[PDB]
Symmetry: C2
Subunit: 316 residues, 2 copies
């Protein structure tokens, strides 16, 4: 069954290249031979104030981007976190097995406890493997630790998930500060590429990318971060290996690298936007997928909850 689980918060109008190439692309590669649950984690979004109309719209558009990036509702389950009560039930239980300092080392209560709800999200589905960036790994180790601690009291109750770190070419960096992960956290969106942004706008950002002064196209993330990061992106978006690109770039300057990467990104995001636009305009397809997904997610997660509750001694 090789069950996997992952998700993204519906906190903006668009995923960026970090999400698409460093998470969803991994999901797409897994869904053929793994039983996959892909979640829009709206409960996590409200740890900061959310506009209600935008929250609902972004929930749908995050799911739509999953489909547009190749997530296949005939092979995977896509669902909205808040529609499955078991997430919060398990999160309460898991919080009772999570040390306070353990969570402090990870402000409102929700901001403090959301790693525990993240653990719940995964453990609720008997998840065997979780694709995650090496920088959001520490949250998963908490999930693994709490699961092991619960299982030591109550043997065999929870699956302890393995961490799936993507290839290093899945790490995408900010184009204006390429020592930093591409993140919505950036000052401006000048170094960030949103999937659903005007493709010409994103191309301009790529042409503007900070490089170095060596004028040597060579992959070395910690000596040439901007040059290396541009190589990551072009490879990940076209499929061409970094070897083939670097060899085809001997003698070339950085201008050639920027133009090519921009063009490849443009050809990447254009079909995505077409699919999202159709899923937004005709929303019955998406809502059917999310409804089927919630029903199947509920069927799995509620049994996990009943098993956990049974072991704790709750009256059923």
């Amino acid at each position: 069954s090789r069950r996997i689980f992952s998700g993204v918060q519906p906190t903006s109008d668009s995923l960026h290249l970090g999400n698409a190439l460093g998470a969803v692309a991994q999901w797409v590669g897994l869904q053929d031979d793994h039983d996959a649950f892909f979640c829009v984690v709206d409960l996590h979004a409200i740890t900061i104030p959310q506009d209600p109309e935008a929250l609902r719209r972004r929930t749908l558009i995050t799911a739509a981007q999953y489909l547009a990036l190749g997530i296949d509702p005939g092979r995977a389950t896509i669902f909205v976190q808040s529609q499955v009560p078991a997430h919060t039930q398990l999160a309460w239980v898991l919080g009772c097995f999570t040390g306070f300092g353990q969570a402090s080392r990870m402000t409102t209560v929700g901001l403090f406890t959301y790693p525990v709800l993240q653990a719940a999200d995964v453990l609720a589905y008997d998840t065997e493997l979780v694709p995650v960036g090496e920088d959001q790994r520490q949250h998963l180790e908490l999930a693994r630790d709490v699961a092991q601690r619960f299982n030591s009291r109550f043997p065999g109750t929870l699956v302890v998930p393995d961490v799936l770190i993507p290839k290093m070419t899945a790490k995408i960096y900010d184009l204006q500060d390429p020592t930093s992960k591409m993140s919505k956290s950036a000052g401006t969106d000048a170094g960030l590429i949103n999937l659903l942004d005007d493709p010409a706008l994103s191309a301009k950002k790529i042409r503007s990318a900070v490089t170095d002064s060596e004028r040597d196209i060579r992959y070395d993330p910690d000596v040439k971060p901007g040059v290396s990061n541009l190589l990551n992106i072009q490879s990940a978006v076209t499929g061409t290996d970094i070897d083939v690109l670097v060899d085809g770039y001997a003698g070339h300057g950085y201008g050639d690298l920027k133009k090519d990467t921009a063009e490849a990104v443009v050809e990447f995001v254009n079909p995505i936007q077409a699919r999202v636009d159709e899923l937004t305009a005709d929303p019955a397809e998406l809502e059917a997928v999310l409804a089927a997904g919630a029903q199947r997610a509920h069927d799995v997660a509620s049994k996990t909850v009943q098993r956990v509750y049974d072991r704790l001694g709750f009256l059923l």
Copy 2:
């Protein structure tokens, strides 16, 4: 409708006189003209490690004590907290609106966040009034504060509950240290009266109660705590006012006060134990009450959750 909500944790084999006279007796007095929900809050119990078999047994026996103390399943809803998923769903939402310091001023995550789940327990039922001792009031003020804060963003979503403080003759103190609330927290159970303990054992504890050196039967909680506390108990258990007892005690010594209170307590707990014993031996009656209660609790609380979710902007 005048809806009320209250509950007790199933953390021991017996409620004590503090619970029976300072909480459940208030509930019994309310259930005739208030729509009442009385909860066995098993989710709170697992903030400390629980033996599974004991947890299940105490859940049932806490409900049985509700019935034996006069809670009427034809007039009130009695249910087990863990059986109603909405408690944890609302608790997650409320935690996102609860300041960290606000909860710190109230260790595992569960120990830290349980005031938020307590707020959820109440607010989930559109509770108009909560009976509580003046010493567990501060938890309810958090519930009221979080409700007001949520309602300021989302007007009219949650009922803000009024606090029902019982008469001061509902405060029951430890018999060995009568400056302290009767609490399971005591060093020994020497100063604590469990409802289901051997009645002769409880009588002995009352005869042993710490008094004073004045040899004057007079109600004054902060000058004569042991003498006053014994007067509380005898009154609350027989219905006789403290005036009638104190006047009938002029010229009397403390020995007479102790004997009388012990006898009255014995006549109080004997019928309770008979009812609990029958509810334990024939458990189908109790389980039917809890099943009906969970169904009605779910019907109310899930609508509160859907309303809260709708206002936040979650996709339904």
